[PDB]
Design a protein around this ligand. Structure first.
Ligand SMILES: O=C(O)CSc1ccc(Cl)cc1
Length: 284
């Protein structure tokens, strides 16, 4: 069923809440035993948001290999994403260790450091060229190289140095800065513009490791980003683009990380983004 018609049908009936709860009811449940070990309590921002053991990213150290991050692997779309929480004061070093070990080219950030008057994640990147950051726990150096500030997003060029081997790599930081404190954007135009900038960079392409995507918990806004990307890619690949079922794609993704898409408004926004984005993907 064409999603645009499904959309008008749900909108006229006002059943977004009922569709959303059906997804919550059918979603996968797998063990998260490593996340709940007492030694990892200060490595988790939220008690109710954990990575499944089968899909969790492991840090390459014998000490403690634990980070709140999951590998989402979409087999038919040929795309991989790492979804993670906003780093904490004691996990900023782990975060950049993961970016290094997984060979990521891009970090996508969908929140501000402060929202609703509270801290949503650590200031984990340098704000001035001449004041670089050193993560002594993981032996990495991070330097700001350049900054391009636009109306809806900022792109930053960062240099990450493995202080152990003196290798360096260029990491692109894509920071979406205008998601509202409450609800979802009214139009998806600026979100879709942002996704096409990440795509154009090469950050989502198979010659790199998976892109690292985060918001505060790494399930809501982060969910919206990878669901819209995967749905548009499937529409460009398949003979019948109207066969793309957004609810079935979301349930496949929820086999790899719990809670992706946090509200009925985020689900509706995801439909709107895919429907509007398809008017490019189908030859305009
Ligand atoms: O290490 C990086 O990410 C890039 S550093 C750089 C320095 C000078 C010029 Cl002209 C370009 C990049």
């Amino acid at each position: 069923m064409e999603m645009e018609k499904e959309f008008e049908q749900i909108d006229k009936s006002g059943s977004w809440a009922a569709i959303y709860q059906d997804i919550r009811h059918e979603a996968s449940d797998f063990p998260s035993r490593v996340a709940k070990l007492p030694k990892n309590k200060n490595r988790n921002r939220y008690r109710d948001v954990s990575p499944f053991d089968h899909s969790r990213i492991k840090l390459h150290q014998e000490d403690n290999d634990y980070i709140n991050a999951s590998l989402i692997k979409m087999e038919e779309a040929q795309r991989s994403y790492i979804l993670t929480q906003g780093p904490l004061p004691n996990t900023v070093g782990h975060f950049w260790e993961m970016v290094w070990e997984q060979k990521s080219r891009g970090v996508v950030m969908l929140n501000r450091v402060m929202e609703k008057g509270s801290l949503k994640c650590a200031q984990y990147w340098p704000q001035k060229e001449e004041k670089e950051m050193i993560f002594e726990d993981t032996n990495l150096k991070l330097t700001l190289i350049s900054e391009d500030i636009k109306s809806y997003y900022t792109v930053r060029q960062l240099e990450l140095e493995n202080l152990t081997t003196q290798e360096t790599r260029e990491i692109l930081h894509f920071h979406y800065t205008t998601w509202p404190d409450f609800g979802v954007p009214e139009s998806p135009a600026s979100f879709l513009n942002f996704l096409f900038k990440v795509r154009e960079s090469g950050s989502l392409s198979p010659e790199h490791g998976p892109v690292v995507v985060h918001c505060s918990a790494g399930i809501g806004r982060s969910g919206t980003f990878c669901l819209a990307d995967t749905c548009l890619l499937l529409m460009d690949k398949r003979k019948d683009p109207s066969s793309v079922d957004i609810k079935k794609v979301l349930l496949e993704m929820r086999k790899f990380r719990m809670g992706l898409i946090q509200t009925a408004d985020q689900l509706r926004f995801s439909y709107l983004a895919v429907i509007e984005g398809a008017k490019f993907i189908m030859g305009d």
